Design a binder for this molecule. Structure first.
Ligand SMILES: *[C@](O)(C(N)=O)[C@H](C[C@@H]1CCNC1=O)NC(=O)[C@H](CC1CC1)n1cccc(NC(=O)OC(C)(C)C)c1=O
Ligand SMILES: *[C@](O)(C(N)=O)[C@H](C[C@@H]1CCNC1=O)NC(=O)[C@H](CC1CC1)n1cccc(NC(=O)OC(C)(C)C)c1=O
Ligand SMILES: [Cl-]
Lengths: 306, 306
């Protein structure tokens, strides 16, 4: 009973956070096995940030220019390389708390937990989504760079995000753990703007299913819709197109509630056209788009992590 | 920048969570030193839960009846006692990952993080407030009992909540770690209901401060109200009275933004009387009351925990 925006438990990632310092710049690093990963802009001064030639900057650095601290213990750096926009520091010590893990690149509309860190120390955890414009709506202050986003499957941590920068209107941009940016952003202190954002329709529908599961039913109507007619209405309110794959993906939730996906779509269509009339769904006065169908199943079925 | 509902890092609690099985009932326990703490209704069947005579049922229990599992490892139970609604199982092994901890009773209006567990394994983490009617709006399925609520200050875990119950309306009740219920609820199957709730005025003001810190300022106005005039209005909308102590507690946020509390209160008065008129504050179309002044200061100044 109840439905909450729920993060993964963070303990397996907490054990991997370290502090990386290069001269006067400090930020967070991820220590897995004998590698520490962090944003490459740890090597820049404020001078360099406007237009850094990173390759050039790194050449002038040495192993001993990188100070890596795990709690009380300094780790000796014995090597360094750059992959895309991340720096990999080989250290002499493998992390005894390294979990089973992999690195993944997620798609827009997918969700993940962020462990916000300052000076190598966990501060807080929260769930967000990769927006269709390839930003995230995070909560990040100066010092948070190198904080990571992740999913847990059973006992395997999938790392999908590392934090690099803030963009206009207080949204955030970063990379996968191979150092490729999500979206068309660069790690440069420069004028950059995200595209116009849209609502993740398939996630809105999953959350309507969560509502029904949790006993909010008032928005169910008597109608059905075609996919074509649903999209005509959705386009008009800046919703992402719903595809047949999305319809198929919502099938398990549809079977659990006995409400056909295109019946739920007719309900959503009406909500978009007429509004909510000051009425709430799962205690929300707007439609929520940061739960995937899998997130809903997980929470409503009680999936747990080893 | 940005502002999210943020839980504490859950790792220190995760290392304390175990599974407690008695006959047909499995739920979660908290393993600290050589004691496992769990809800005493673990000892009941179904006909027991009418009005269970806990003291009598416990006498008939053997230590051997309590199957405590910590990951792959059976903990041997060597004693058992009851304190109010909590069972203390003495086991032959002290938990090596026992953090620094305290047991505290929180006040209504204050927040904490919930680590929702099933079968002694973490499922997720989220932030809650102890409501003025002594319920929490959580997300708990069958198997969740024994999940705890906590705060962390530096390296110290303050355990404030252990989960026992769902009520009608999909809200939740439980005890402190000395086993005393928050509110007038009892641990048996008997029809039980939350009293009427109220909005935590001081928390709504803190969140309006959070919004200003983040540059969301459209609702600010040049007007001022007296405290009495504010309370005349807010009380009509089922908000808690704002006291001078609340005004003092908001001092830091007031000083940080330069906006006097009684200035800010005129915004709140106007938002109550006229609604938001299609706009949002920190992405919400409703007034949020589950951030304390401290939560705002912590998240907006990046304070850290290890
Ligand atoms: C990390 O480098 C860090 N040390 O934590 C920084 C985190 C951000 C600070 C404020 N919020 C954050 O998430 N990242 C930066 O400071 C980046 C560096 C990046 C380019 C390599 N950075 C530098 C300069 C400016 C900005 N952003 C900025 O000015 O944003 C607006 C919205 C004002 C245009 C930035 O992100
Ligand atoms: C735990 O005991 C557990 N095993 O996990 C139960 C957790 C709840 C089940 C679903 N969500 C929960 O939070 N708690 C109970 O089942 C309690 C037992 C407690 C009192 C000793 N319990 C027992 C009977 C009834 C109810 N509530 C109930 O039926 O509520 C509705 C809303 C259906 C009227 C209850 O919580
Ligand atoms: Cl809302």
């Amino acid at each position: 009973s109840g439905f909450r925006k729920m993060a993964f438990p963070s303990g397996k990632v907490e054990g991997c956070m370290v502090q990386v310092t290069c001269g006067t710049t400090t930020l967070n690093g991820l220590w897995l096995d004998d590698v520490v990963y962090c944003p490459r802009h740890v090597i820049c001064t404020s001078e360099d940030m406007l237009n850094p030639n990173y390759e050039d900057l790194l050449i002038r650095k040495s192993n001993h220019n990188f100070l890596v601290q795990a709690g009380n213990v300094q780790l000796r750096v014995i090597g360094h390389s750059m992959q895309n926009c991340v720096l990999k520091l080989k250290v002499d010590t493998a992390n005894p708390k390294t979990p089973k893990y992999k690195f993944v690149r997620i798609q827009p509309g997918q969700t993940f937990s962020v462990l916000a860190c300052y000076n190598g120390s966990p501060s807080g955890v929260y769930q967000c989504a990769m927006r269709p414009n390839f930003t995230i709506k995070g909560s990040f202050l100066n010092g948070s760079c190198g904080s990571v986003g992740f999913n847990i499957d059973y006992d395997c941590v999938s790392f999908c995000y590392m934090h690099h920068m803030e963009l206009p209107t207080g949204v955030h941009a970063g990379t996968d753990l191979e150092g490729n940016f999500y979206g068309p952003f660069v790690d440069r202190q420069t004028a950059q703007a995200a595209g116009t954002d849209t609502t993740i329709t398939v996630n809105v529908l999953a959350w309507l299913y969560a509502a029904v599961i949790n006993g909010d039913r008032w928005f169910l109507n008597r109608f059905t819709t075609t996919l074509n007619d649903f999209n005509l209405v959705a386009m008009k309110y800046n919703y992402e197109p719903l595809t047949q794959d999305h319809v198929d993906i919502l099938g398990p939730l549809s079977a659990q509630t006995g409400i056909a996906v295109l019946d739920m779509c007719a309900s959503l269509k009406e909500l978009l056209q007429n509004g909510m009339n000051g009425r709430t769904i799962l205690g929300s006065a707007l439609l929520e788009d940061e739960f995937t169908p899998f997130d809903v199943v997980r929470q409503c079925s009680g999936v747990t992590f080893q």
